[PDB]
mmCIF file of C-alpha atoms in Angstrom:
data_model
loop_
_atom_site.group_PDB
_atom_site.id
_atom_site.type_symbol
_atom_site.label_atom_id
_atom_site.label_comp_id
_atom_site.label_asym_id
_atom_site.label_seq_id
_atom_site.Cartn_x
_atom_site.Cartn_y
_atom_site.Cartn_z
ATOM 1 C CA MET A 1 99.705 93.422 124.038
ATOM 2 C CA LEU A 2 101.594 96.521 122.714
ATOM 3 C CA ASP A 3 105.166 95.476 122.188
ATOM 4 C CA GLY A 4 107.795 98.125 121.325
ATOM 5 C CA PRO A 5 108.721 100.867 120.477
ATOM 6 C CA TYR A 6 111.122 99.360 117.908
ATOM 7 C CA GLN A 7 113.574 101.499 115.925
ATOM 8 C CA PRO A 8 113.390 102.032 112.160
ATOM 9 C CA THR A 9 114.436 98.862 110.219
ATOM 10 C CA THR A 10 113.844 96.625 107.151
ATOM 11 C CA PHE A 11 112.375 93.163 107.710
ATOM 12 C CA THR A 12 109.519 90.882 106.616
ATOM 13 C CA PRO A 13 107.107 90.408 109.514
ATOM 14 C CA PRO A 14 105.092 87.277 110.362
ATOM 15 C CA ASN A 15 101.484 86.997 109.332
ATOM 16 C CA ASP A 16 98.850 87.812 111.938
ATOM 17 C CA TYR A 17 100.660 90.871 113.497
ATOM 18 C CA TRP A 18 99.688 94.512 113.140
ATOM 19 C CA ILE A 19 102.652 96.756 112.593
ATOM 20 C CA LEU A 20 101.612 100.093 114.151
ATOM 21 C CA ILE A 21 103.943 102.867 112.938
ATOM 22 C CA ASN A 22 104.279 106.234 114.818
ATOM 23 C CA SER A 23 105.051 108.567 111.853
ATOM 24 C CA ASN A 24 107.429 111.416 112.938
ATOM 25 C CA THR A 25 108.116 113.180 109.627
ATOM 26 C CA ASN A 26 106.338 114.533 106.584
ATOM 27 C CA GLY A 27 108.316 112.209 104.353
ATOM 28 C CA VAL A 28 108.159 108.483 103.603
ATOM 29 C CA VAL A 29 106.515 106.584 106.453
ATOM 30 C CA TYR A 30 107.152 103.079 105.119
ATOM 31 C CA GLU A 31 107.761 101.206 101.947
ATOM 32 C CA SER A 32 106.525 97.680 101.244
ATOM 33 C CA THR A 33 107.026 95.266 98.297
ATOM 34 C CA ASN A 34 107.360 91.704 97.171
ATOM 35 C CA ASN A 35 108.973 92.782 93.897
ATOM 36 C CA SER A 36 106.323 91.016 91.881
ATOM 37 C CA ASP A 37 102.724 92.266 92.235
ATOM 38 C CA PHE A 38 102.737 94.565 95.358
ATOM 39 C CA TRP A 39 104.262 97.903 96.081
ATOM 40 C CA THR A 40 102.931 100.316 98.729
ATOM 41 C CA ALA A 41 104.590 103.393 100.037
ATOM 42 C CA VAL A 42 103.003 105.770 102.493
ATOM 43 C CA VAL A 43 103.832 109.444 102.449
ATOM 44 C CA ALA A 44 102.809 111.843 105.253
ATOM 45 C CA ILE A 45 101.415 115.378 104.640
ATOM 46 C CA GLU A 46 101.282 117.777 107.525
ATOM 47 C CA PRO A 47 98.095 119.908 108.203
ATOM 48 C CA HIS A 48 97.141 122.893 105.966
ATOM 49 C CA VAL A 49 99.197 122.359 102.740
ATOM 50 C CA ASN A 50 98.112 123.971 99.476
ATOM 51 C CA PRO A 51 98.473 121.828 96.362
ATOM 52 C CA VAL A 52 102.265 121.412 95.765
ATOM 53 C CA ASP A 53 104.722 119.069 94.108
ATOM 54 C CA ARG A 54 107.018 117.180 96.485
ATOM 55 C CA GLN A 55 109.798 114.695 95.787
ATOM 56 C CA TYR A 56 109.929 111.319 97.529
ATOM 57 C CA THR A 57 112.390 108.433 97.237
ATOM 58 C CA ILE A 58 110.530 105.136 97.285
ATOM 59 C CA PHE A 59 111.972 101.782 96.309
ATOM 60 C CA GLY A 60 115.151 103.593 95.262
ATOM 61 C CA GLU A 61 113.153 105.755 92.810
ATOM 62 C CA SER A 62 112.682 109.502 92.876
ATOM 63 C CA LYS A 63 109.052 110.462 92.431
ATOM 64 C CA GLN A 64 107.147 113.707 92.237
ATOM 65 C CA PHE A 65 103.677 113.721 93.614
ATOM 66 C CA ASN A 66 101.181 116.535 93.642
ATOM 67 C CA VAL A 67 100.053 116.727 97.246
ATOM 68 C CA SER A 68 97.673 118.799 99.376
ATOM 69 C CA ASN A 69 95.978 118.760 102.864
ATOM 70 C CA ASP A 70 93.123 121.057 103.652
ATOM 71 C CA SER A 71 92.587 119.434 107.092
ATOM 72 C CA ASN A 72 93.667 120.208 110.692
ATOM 73 C CA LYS A 73 94.897 116.610 110.695
ATOM 74 C CA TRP A 74 97.724 114.665 109.012
ATOM 75 C CA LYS A 75 97.071 112.892 105.758
ATOM 76 C CA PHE A 76 98.761 109.567 104.962
ATOM 77 C CA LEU A 77 98.716 108.617 101.296
ATOM 78 C CA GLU A 78 98.975 104.972 100.241
ATOM 79 C CA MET A 79 100.797 105.084 96.899
ATOM 80 C CA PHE A 80 100.324 101.742 95.103
ATOM 81 C CA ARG A 81 101.407 99.950 91.973
ATOM 82 C CA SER A 82 100.971 96.238 90.896
ATOM 83 C CA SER A 83 103.922 96.123 88.548
ATOM 84 C CA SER A 84 107.427 97.625 88.277
ATOM 85 C CA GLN A 85 106.518 99.276 85.037
ATOM 86 C CA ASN A 86 103.495 101.208 86.330
ATOM 87 C CA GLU A 87 103.377 104.594 87.959
ATOM 88 C CA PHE A 88 102.075 104.838 91.520
ATOM 89 C CA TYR A 89 98.503 105.991 92.247
ATOM 90 C CA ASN A 90 96.897 107.175 95.516
ATOM 91 C CA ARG A 91 94.949 104.092 96.503
ATOM 92 C CA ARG A 92 94.018 105.058 100.049
ATOM 93 C CA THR A 93 94.106 108.035 102.397
ATOM 94 C CA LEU A 94 94.215 108.027 106.240
ATOM 95 C CA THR A 95 93.353 111.418 107.790
ATOM 96 C CA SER A 96 94.538 111.252 111.334
ATOM 97 C CA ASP A 97 95.423 113.334 114.389
ATOM 98 C CA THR A 98 97.265 110.418 116.042
ATOM 99 C CA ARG A 99 99.956 110.077 113.392
ATOM 100 C CA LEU A 100 99.657 106.306 113.659
ATOM 101 C CA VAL A 101 99.628 103.990 110.643
ATOM 102 C CA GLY A 102 98.850 100.215 110.516
ATOM 103 C CA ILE A 103 99.912 97.228 108.312
ATOM 104 C CA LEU A 104 98.827 93.616 108.649
ATOM 105 C CA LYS A 105 99.503 90.383 106.667
ATOM 106 C CA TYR A 106 96.620 88.057 107.066
ATOM 107 C CA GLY A 107 94.647 85.440 105.098
ATOM 108 C CA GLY A 108 96.322 86.081 101.762
ATOM 109 C CA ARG A 109 95.866 89.857 101.978
ATOM 110 C CA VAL A 110 97.616 92.927 103.293
ATOM 111 C CA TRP A 111 95.415 95.100 105.563
ATOM 112 C CA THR A 112 95.735 98.807 106.355
ATOM 113 C CA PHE A 113 93.702 101.504 108.078
ATOM 114 C CA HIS A 114 92.082 104.369 106.184
ATOM 115 C CA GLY A 115 89.309 106.962 106.380
ATOM 116 C CA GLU A 116 89.336 109.671 109.064
ATOM 117 C CA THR A 117 89.991 109.383 112.748
ATOM 118 C CA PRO A 118 88.386 108.564 115.018
ATOM 119 C CA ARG A 119 86.434 106.564 112.411
ATOM 120 C CA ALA A 120 89.190 104.804 110.374
ATOM 121 C CA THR A 121 88.634 101.153 109.538
ATOM 122 C CA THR A 122 90.666 98.451 107.927
ATOM 123 C CA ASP A 123 90.638 97.394 104.278
ATOM 124 C CA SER A 124 92.430 94.648 102.371
ATOM 125 C CA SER A 125 94.554 94.462 99.255
ATOM 126 C CA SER A 126 95.045 91.170 97.438
ATOM 127 C CA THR A 127 98.386 89.680 96.365
ATOM 128 C CA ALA A 128 99.512 86.332 94.766
ATOM 129 C CA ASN A 129 102.717 86.447 96.893
ATOM 130 C CA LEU A 130 101.994 87.600 100.461
ATOM 131 C CA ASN A 131 104.865 85.739 101.988
ATOM 132 C CA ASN A 132 107.598 87.747 100.139
ATOM 133 C CA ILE A 133 106.149 91.194 101.100
ATOM 134 C CA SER A 134 108.863 92.873 103.191
ATOM 135 C CA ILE A 135 108.669 96.365 104.783
ATOM 136 C CA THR A 136 111.011 99.250 105.486
ATOM 137 C CA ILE A 137 109.874 101.398 108.348
ATOM 138 C CA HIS A 138 111.248 104.943 108.682
ATOM 139 C CA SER A 139 109.957 105.623 112.158
ATOM 140 C CA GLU A 140 109.352 103.976 115.614
ATOM 141 C CA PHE A 141 106.837 101.107 115.624
ATOM 142 C CA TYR A 142 104.938 98.687 117.764
ATOM 143 C CA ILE A 143 103.745 95.099 117.418
ATOM 144 C CA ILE A 144 100.206 93.983 118.111
ATOM 145 C CA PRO A 145 98.855 90.453 117.309
ATOM 146 C CA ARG A 146 95.690 90.192 115.272
ATOM 147 C CA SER A 147 94.045 88.688 118.429
ATOM 148 C CA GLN A 148 94.104 92.316 119.736
ATOM 149 C CA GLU A 149 92.964 94.210 116.650
ATOM 150 C CA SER A 150 90.267 96.116 118.661
ATOM 151 C CA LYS A 151 93.201 97.548 120.606
ATOM 152 C CA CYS A 152 95.083 98.518 117.433
ATOM 153 C CA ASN A 153 91.844 100.106 116.191
ATOM 154 C CA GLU A 154 91.720 102.153 119.444
ATOM 155 C CA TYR A 155 95.299 103.281 119.011
ATOM 156 C CA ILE A 156 94.970 104.205 115.293
ATOM 157 C CA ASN A 157 91.906 106.293 116.059
ATOM 158 C CA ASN A 158 92.685 107.789 119.537
ATOM 159 C CA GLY A 159 96.506 107.608 119.811
ATOM 160 C CA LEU A 160 98.818 105.908 122.322
#
């Protein structure tokens, strides 16, 4: 079921597989785009961080985000834009003590986990071009087929 760990790389995964990323920095966890209507980058914020501006390179662009974390857990911020001439906004947050992040391509949508562990659930984001969405992963990752989502859900929420 759980294939991997696989080392950091760029590729475009098949549909119907969860990519489950074990984040190991407080920088950019992954960046994903089809260069048309879909850009998502996740940034990781360590526990107990007062509001502060931090610089991140995503999609070859230097960004400053105002960032905070009042929790005992890690916060993973989905930064999203739907066009190359928009700024990013914080579309989703995953508050986690597992440090695991999930991405799935399925049924015309991209699915990720958000909320707070151990009660994070999936959500979808629409796109007109799902097939050309690639991903750059900056950390070790695993592969779990959709068939076994309940397992991926367990991992996201309770760790490996």
